């Protein structure tokens, strides 16, 4: 049968959001799984920046590369 290999949509932790790639807005609400090897960025709320290891590569399983990253909002 088919293998569903993707990551889910992460729930907004702190004041901020998530920067996707080939996705526009109005979406990113109800999505099942992101494609394998998909890299997102952790942005701070609004147009605020963060200095952290902000990179998440979607794996072949339901989780990202390193899922625990305290992105300090710094501008």
UniProtKB/Swiss-Prot annotation:
It is found in: Cell membrane; Postsynaptic cell membrane; Cell projection, Dendrite. Highly expressed in brain. Weakly expressed in heart, small intestine and uterus. Isoform 1A: Mainly expressed in granular cell and molecular layer. Isoform 1B: Mainly expressed in Purkinje cells. Isoform 1E: Predominantly expressed in peripheral tissues as kidney, lung, trachea, colon, small intestine, stomach, bone marrow, thymus and mammary gland. Residues 7-73 form the Sushi domain. Glycans are attached at residue 61. It comes from the Eukaryota. Heterodimer of GABBR1 and GABBR2. Homodimers may form, but are inactive. Isoform 1E (without C-terminal intracellular domain) is unable to dimerize via a coiled-coil interaction with GABBR2. Interacts (via C-terminus) with ATF4 (via leucine zipper domain). Interacts with JAKMIP1. Alpha-helical parts of the C-terminal intracellular region mediate heterodimeric interaction with GABBR2. The linker region between the transmembrane domain 3 (TM3) and the transmembrane domain 4 (TM4) probably plays a role in the specificity for G-protein coupling. It is linked to Neurodevelopmental disorder with language delay and variable cognitive abnormalities: An autosomal dominant disorder characterized by language delay ranging from mild to severe, varying degrees of intellectual disability, and learning difficulties. Additional features include early motor delay, muscular hypotonia, behavioral abnormalities, sleep disorders, and seizures. Belongs to the G-protein coupled receptor 3 family. GABA-B receptor subfamily. Component of a heterodimeric G-protein coupled receptor for GABA, formed by GABBR1 and GABBR2. Within the heterodimeric GABA receptor, only GABBR1 seems to bind agonists, while GABBR2 mediates coupling to G proteins. Ligand binding causes a conformation change that triggers signaling via guanine nucleotide-binding proteins (G proteins) and modulates the activity of down-stream effectors, such as adenylate cyclase. This is Gamma-aminobutyric acid type B receptor subunit 1. It comes from Homo sapiens. The lineage of its organism: Eukaryota, Metazoa, Chordata, Craniata, Vertebrata. The gene is GABBR1.
């Amino acid at each position: 049968g088919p293998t569903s290999e993707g990551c889910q949509i992460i729930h907004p932790p702190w004041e901020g959001g998530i920067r996707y790639r080939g996705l526009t807005r109005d979406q990113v609400k109800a999505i099942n799984f992101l494609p394998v090897d998909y890299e997102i960025e952790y942005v701070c709320r609004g147009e605020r920046e963060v200095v952290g290891p902000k990179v998440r590569k979607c794996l072949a399983n339901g989780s990202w590369t390193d899922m625990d990253t305290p992105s300090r909002c710094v501008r």
